Structures are given as structure tokens and as C-alpha cells.
């Protein structure tokens, strides 16, 4: 999820399906 | 119990994704049809209230 290059280099990632207690191999929780 | 058939799709590579609208707000925009077509009639579709 990033806005345009042109404006701003700043990335947030979604993992989809998951929960972020087990993603590593600001936290948000989403359906 | 049993391993059900979701966890067998979503295993091989295939998911769901969910829907941008949650049912809630299908909800809302219904309600919101209902209470202009009843206070306003057609007005309301045609510009202000
Ligand atoms: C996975 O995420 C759900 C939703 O936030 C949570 O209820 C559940 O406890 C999580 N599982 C863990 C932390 O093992």
C-alpha cells in the first residue's frame, strides 16, 4: 500500500489471511 | 473433528478475499433509500431533499 512515487516512498504492507502473531519468519488487526 | 473443506482450498494456494462493503453499510445505504423515498418521494434522487 503506497501512495505515488512522485510524492512519497513510504510503504505499508498488508498479509493477507493471517494474523501478525505469526508473520515474522504499529499493528493493526483487520478482518 | 474433521479437517473441513476451507482449509483444504485455502492450503493449495487458493483464498478468499473479503468484500470492500461490509453488511453494515449495504445496511445503511437501504436505510438510507428508505428514509429519503418515504420523507421526500422522488426529490431526493433529483437533488436536495
Ligand atoms: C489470531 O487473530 C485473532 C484476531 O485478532 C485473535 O483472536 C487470535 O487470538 C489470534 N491468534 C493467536 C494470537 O494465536
Redesign the interface.
Known amino acids: 500500500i503506497t501512495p505515488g512515487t512522485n510524492t512519497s516512498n513510504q510503504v505499508a504492507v498488508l498479509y493477507?489471511?493471517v494474523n501478525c502473531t505469526e508473520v515474522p519468519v504499529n499493528v493493526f488487526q483487520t478482518? | 473433528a474433521a479437517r473441513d473443506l476451507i482449509c483444504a482450498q485455502?492450503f493449495n494456494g487458493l483464498?478468499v478475499?473479503?468484500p470492500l462493503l461490509t453488511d453494515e453499510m449495504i445496511a445503511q445505504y437501504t436505510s438510507a433509500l428508505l428514509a429519503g423515498t418515504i420523507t421526500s418521494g422522488w426529490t431526493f434522487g433529483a437533488g436536495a431533499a
Open positions: 493477507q489471511g478482518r | 485455502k483464498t478475499l473479503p
